[PDB]
Write a protein that binds this ligand. Sequence first.
Ligand SMILES: [Mg+2]
Ligand code: NA
Length: 1213
Amino acid sequence: MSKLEKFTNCYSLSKTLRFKAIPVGKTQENIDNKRLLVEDEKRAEDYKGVKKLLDRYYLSFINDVLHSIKLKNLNNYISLFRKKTRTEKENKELENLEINLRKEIAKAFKGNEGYKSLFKKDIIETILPEFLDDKDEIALVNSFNGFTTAFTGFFDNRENMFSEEAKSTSIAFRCINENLTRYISNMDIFEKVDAIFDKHEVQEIKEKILNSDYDVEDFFEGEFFNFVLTQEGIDVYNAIIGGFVTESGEKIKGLNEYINLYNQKTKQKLPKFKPLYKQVLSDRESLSFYGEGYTSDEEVLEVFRNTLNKNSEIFSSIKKLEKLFKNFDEYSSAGIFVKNGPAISTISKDIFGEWNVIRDKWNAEYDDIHLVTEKYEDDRRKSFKKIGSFSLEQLQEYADADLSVVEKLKEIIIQKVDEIYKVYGSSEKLFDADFVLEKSLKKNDAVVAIMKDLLDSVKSFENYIKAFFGEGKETNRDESFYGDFVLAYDILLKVDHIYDAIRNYVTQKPYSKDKFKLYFQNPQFMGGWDKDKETDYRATILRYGSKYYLAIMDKKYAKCLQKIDKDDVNGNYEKINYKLLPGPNKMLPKVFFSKKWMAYYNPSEDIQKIYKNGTFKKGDMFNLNDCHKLIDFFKDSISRYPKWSNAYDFNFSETEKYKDIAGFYREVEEQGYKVSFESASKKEVDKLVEEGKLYMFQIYNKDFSDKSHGTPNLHTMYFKLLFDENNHGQIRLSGGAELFMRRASLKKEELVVHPANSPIANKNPDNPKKTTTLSYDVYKDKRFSEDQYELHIPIAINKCPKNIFKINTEVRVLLKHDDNPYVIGIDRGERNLLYIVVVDGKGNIVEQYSLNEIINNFNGIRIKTDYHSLLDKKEKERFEARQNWTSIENIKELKAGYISQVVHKICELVEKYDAVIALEDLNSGFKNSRVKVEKQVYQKFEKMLIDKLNYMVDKKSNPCATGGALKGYQITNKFESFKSMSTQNGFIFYIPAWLTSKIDPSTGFVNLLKTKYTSIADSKKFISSFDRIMYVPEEDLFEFALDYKNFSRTDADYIKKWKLYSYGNRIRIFRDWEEVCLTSAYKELFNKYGINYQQGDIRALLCEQSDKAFYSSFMALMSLMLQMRNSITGRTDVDFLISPVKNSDGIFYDSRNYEAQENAILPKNADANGAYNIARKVLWAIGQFKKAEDEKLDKVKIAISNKEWLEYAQTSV
RNA sequence: AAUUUCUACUAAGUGUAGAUGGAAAUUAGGUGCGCUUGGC
DNA sequence: GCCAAGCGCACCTAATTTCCTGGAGGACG
DNA sequence: CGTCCTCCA
Ligand SMILES: [Mg+2]
Ligand code: NA
């Protein structure tokens, strides 16, 4: 036996199969003539409208409750929440006060008498109309009378808002778990940071943000939190923190701005506040002003031409500012000023090449006067900070003999004006009055590039100009320059709103129609599949051979398939006969205590008293003997209930054996499902479609083509298995199917075509058949060029699981008693997206390779796909698009594509080796800081892996075999959320990543030294703590003998005593890279300071140095020597791992000696080393399971400590 | 360069290989650019 | 040239809820 | 009463 096969039929899950629906015969014309698709497209728009009118009600309902709430538990919860020493029982009381706070919110909604009617037809029929005023809005709502069933799901989505549970879509959850937690964390930050705010700034927030009705401090007391339950108060509170922008553009500072300024001014690091999340269903309007944008291509072109032609004022303002600078000499250089700050940085760079040069020259002249250095540089920085402005004459001081500042400036303005003209010559045709654009602006990259290139050059000019404004408050200021310069600068600034607004419009995605749902004039269309509901749902399934069909009865002919009999002679369709008894624990009481049934069969008061009282259910009023007499009442009513009695061949148990009522309900549930097919005359059914009484679509994907001949999609197997006699409820067909129309979005004529009989280039370089020639055209994206029906079919897998155990526990047990358990270790990364190492129970490397490339072999042909390269390209295409205002392509499909191959390889690995999976326990705070690197695959990899392992099927297996489609493996727990995961998800273990990569696999050696240069005396103490430092002539290496117990915070190490050598090279990273030969660099350093490095033990000699640079360069070299991992950024060709320690045979581990070998015993590179040691850290956890009794396996801690890891790693060898 | 959809193909000629939980709702994040005030 | 706090706009990505129902019951001609 | 939409849990 294997460990996998114990994991079938563990839990239920639902999935959706999707198909094209192809109209058969006259159905399309009959659908055309009745205009069914037009009705459905309009209904979808109106449906979204009504959904908006309903929210306007729900929101008003929400805000009236929330505005009137005073939380009772509040002050007790805030008290206990801020306690810093909580006993376990206090933690429990905290959770109880959190629960009670949410129940307080849920009851304030649900205690309303009319609460229930907010989710039945009353809200559409009555409530929402009386609440509305617009005649047209009211008529829109009324148009769904008799159709409110179409809102059942939407009512569930709205119900969710009022749950008391800690669930993400709940108002209560948003208020208490999320916003109250931030509010309380902000109270602490207020008490720390309070003093930094002066009286003026607190008053400004009070006057402009608090309407002068509150003090800023009030929103940091516990009692004020009720103010913040509605979007209104959230807005005010986030404005205290972040400020706002006035109608005139002034940015009023919030508290976080003042904290940042203070930090930046004092070089401190005080914490900032967090803003509160939004109120559920709020219609948010910002408190900051932002001007009106543009709404059409024509408007944009008119604005662009009115405001930017040669004769426009903005152009003229440039021709003034040019002619002005071009005549600098008529104005006194002592009177034109560059404000100190960014303006001097800009001007420093344009004239001296670097931003800091003017500050540098200033510092040099300061030193000339004033010459401890910690205050000096700071006192001098302060004195330089006290300067507000710098004249042009003053700057000429800093010019050098050949340089003249004024002359250099006017070159720069000509350089930027010539750049502006340059772009105008390319913008000639765009200014023509006769110009009209063929392509829409949001699809016309050529026109937008002309517009953006022009706008950019004008912006570039504007930022240069702005540095010449100075502080402005200068007494010396030359108003014969300023006066006109300010008139022209103020009109130029008008290009700011234009630039923003043009980018805001031009970058919008163009409108794309969504598919829409088809109802066939039925508010419960295709609701389910039960025979006794065919007439209400008016949709069934048919089979003719291998082909399947959806059959829809017209609103006027619901019974037309009830009549049809076998055509004994000619051919016949098979019509499905589907019966389902869902949720017997609810349906059985409802059916057999109905007024319809209690007439026929009267209860005993015995029978009646139980269900009224409830002595049938396990709980506090439980009484076993009553369930038995009730199970039989039900069992005796099933006999007399014909539509159930003859639909399911029941075979119950001896009643005396049921332990509770649920033991009965489970047998009804499993047996309440049956699917068969009866004959129907194909002549009559066809004529029904002909006469328009029946609509017929073939349920299609490519595996049903007459030309299909390969392995079908897993989903095609699922679908056919729905109706296979060997499927005994492993996969049930579910209700809630849906049919949609997706209008074509490409024109056939506009499609890339490969014409018949002209050879097509094959793209796979390992494919020896270089060309393919077909006799028919082949079109790119062909499927989007015609309207398409799609059918979405829900299915349910393992609805009645028989293998109920805690999945994690079972894995630990199985690992304990497994003589040689294999591990697949997986290192997550971005140099290598994924890297795989498989080990055996003894830690031997069995397989190792990167997954940057997917190698697939089929039909003798090999194919390699460098997905790391493909994602890299996509990531760069998107960066460029963002900066260029061009189309931002998706990356997530490509990620999914890549990840699917990865997951397929991993599943094969799991099956081949019966192996469990080892991953880094990456906290979610690490995984978000790498989302900026859009190669990022960490979390999507996890989701798709965990999903597949919820029901893992070998498509090639026999469907009835273990691991086949009817008996999939479930070796991860049912995916509910990341929120709720532990460090073990069945076969997946998450272990501490610490020192899995930066460790010498052949010795266990790690770098536990702190080698940042801090001071001369610390460097002397560091050098002196080695047992010996000497040059080794016979090896041309420097040896550094250390005992780790002589060094700070090295306790984790186990071996303690090491001899380090200057062996090989290293890649130093700095801002770029350089290669360093360690021995040669040590010789350079010692020679630079006259050091006789041949004098045996040399550390006393080294401590005789007085130069700080020696000790600093020496610590740097030590760091490079202890830097075992070495790579070049964005590079395949360098990622080697090299150790400064010898192994027992006196050789240095160097991954590059193993990267060569096809079958390496040790890791081939640093990423392999990481995956390898992640796997071993799980091998250790398996060692812990072996140390423990089975009763206690659930409590074995799996996170190896850092000290246990170094001992483990250093005694493996 | 074809697809229920996606990725990679052409795979022997209207397709091949692997993956594929939909629908609705709510909410959050990341990138990029502009503006405000600031820090090397 | 780099970066911080905050406001805005455009885009794409993604976490976590819910349902995956037939038969009684009502409203209506 | 026969039909169609709503409601239950
Ligand atoms: Mg196939
Ligand atoms: Na942003």
